[PDB]
Structure 1
Amino acid sequence: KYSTFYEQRATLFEELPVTSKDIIFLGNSITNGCEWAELFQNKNVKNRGISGDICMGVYDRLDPIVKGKPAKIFLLIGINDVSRGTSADKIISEISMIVRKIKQESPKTKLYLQSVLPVNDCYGMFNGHTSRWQVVKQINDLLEPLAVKEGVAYIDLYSHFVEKETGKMNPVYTNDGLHLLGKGYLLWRDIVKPYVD
C-alpha cells in the first residue's frame, strides 16, 4: 500500500511545476497531513509529503524538486526508517546524501533540517515506531552537528513537542502517538513561521 501510494503522489509531483519562489515541505505522513499553504496563508508553500516515506524514498524523488531551484526546503524524515529497525547512524548517513544532492543541484536553495519529532506509546498504536522512542533523541543528537558541518539550518521542533519528564511526545498533540492533531500543526507553524517569511 505504501509503494502504490508513493507512486501516486510521486507521479502527481512530476506534473506540478516547482519555481524559484517556492517553499517546499518535504517528508513523510507528518508532512503529508497538513495543508501547508493554508497554514501559512502563502501561495508559494507547497506540500511534497508522502505518507510512509523513508530517507531513500525522498532521495529517489528529488529531481522534480531540485530542478525547479526552489527558495526553501523544509525536510522532516526518518521516523519510518526507525520503524524498520535502521540505526541512527545509517539514517544520518542517508540524510547526508539528501543534503549533498540538494546543495549540488540547487546551491541557492535554503535547506532547513527539522528535528525528528518524539513519539508516544501510550495509545498503543504504531508499535514499530513508538517502541523505539529513544532512537529519536539519538538521531537529533547527530542531526544538529550534521547541519552545522554542511552549512544548513537546524530547527528544534523536538523540544517543544516533548515532555521533558518522559522523553515522549506530549499526548495533547496526538491521538495515536505518531501523527499530529490540528493543535500540533499550529505549534509547528508558530516555530517555523519566522523561517518562512
Structure 2
Amino acid sequence: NAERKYSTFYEQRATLFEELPVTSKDIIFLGNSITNGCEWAELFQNKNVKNRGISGDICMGVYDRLDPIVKGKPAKIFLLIGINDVSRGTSADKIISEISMIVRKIKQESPKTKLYLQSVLPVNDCYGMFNGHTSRWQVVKQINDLLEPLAVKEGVAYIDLYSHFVEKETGKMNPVYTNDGLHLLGKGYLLWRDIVKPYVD
C-alpha cells in the first residue's frame, strides 16, 4: 500500500515534469521529499529556480528521470538524494556508486551545467517516526565522507549542509529544524537558504 503510493506519486510528478520546459537559465533543485517540500523560487526570490523534488525518491528514481531536466541544459543543478536508499538498507558504497552514475549522466548530456552535490542531511530518532530512516542515522556520515571526494574526483562542487543541521554531540539532526526527525520545518529551509544562496547567486 505504501510502495504503491510512492510509485503512483512518482509517476504523477515525473509526468508533470515532462510537460514543463527547462531552459538554459534554469536552476534546478533535484531530490526527494526534502527537495519536494520547498517553494524554491520564493525562498531565493528568483524566478529561474525550479522544483524537481519527488517525495520518496531514490538514486535510480532520479537517474531514470534526468532526461526532461538535462535536455534543457539548465544553468545549475543542486542534487540532494540518498536517504530513502538508506532506509532500504542500501550500503553507503552502493549509494555513492549510484550518485556517481547521476553525476556522469548529467556531465555527458549537459556538460555546461554546474552540478552541486549536497551532503545527505542528518536524521533523528527522537520523534519516533520514520524508523527505517532514523535508526540508520550513522549511515549519513558514511555517505558524506565518500560524497565529498566523489565531488572533487568528478570536478563538481560539494555543499556541506550536514554540519549546520547536525548536533555535533549526537550525530543527529538538531530538533529545531524538524518535527519528525527527517523532513524540514520552515526554519530548516531558511537555514538551507542561507547556506546555498551564495551558490544560487
**TM superposition score category, shorter chain reference:** over 0.9
Q: Secondary structure at the match of 1:102?
A: helix
Q: Secondary structure at the match of 1:95?
A: helix
TM-score by length of 2: 0.98
- The one-character-per-residue Cα deviations of 1:37-92 (angstroms, maximum 9, x if unpaired) are 00000000000000000000000000000000000000000000000000000000
Cα distance in 2, alignment partners of residues 47 and 153 from structure 1 = 20
Aligned equivalent of 2:13, options 5, 9, 20? 9
Cα distance in 2, alignment partners of residues 28 and 174 from structure 1 = 16
- The one-character-per-residue Cα deviations of 1:172-197 (angstroms, maximum 9, x if unpaired) are 00000000000000000000000001
Aligned equivalent of 1:125, options 123, 129, 132? 129
Cα distance in 2, alignment partners of residues 89 and 25 from structure 1 = 24
Q: Secondary structure at the match of 1:91?
A: helix
Identity %: 100
Query: Does 1:116 find its partner at 2:126?
Result: no
> Aligned residue for 1:43?
47
Query: Does 1:165 find its partner at 2:169?
Result: yes
Q: Secondary structure at the match of 1:120?
A: coil
Aligned equivalent of 2:28, options 24, 29, 48? 24
> Aligned residue for 1:98?
102
- The one-character-per-residue Cα deviations of 1:108-162 (angstroms, maximum 9, x if unpaired) are 0000000000000000000000000000000000000000000000000000000
Runs of 5+ consecutive residues of structure 2 not aligned to the other structure = none
Question: Aligned-pair distance for 1:22?
Answer: 0.1
Q: Secondary structure at the match of 1:111?
A: strand
> Aligned residue for 2:146?
142
**How many residues end up aligned between the 2 structures?**
197
Cα distance in 2, alignment partners of residues 29 and 146 from structure 1 = 23
TM-score by length of 1: 1.00
Runs of 5+ consecutive residues of structure 1 not aligned to the other structure = none
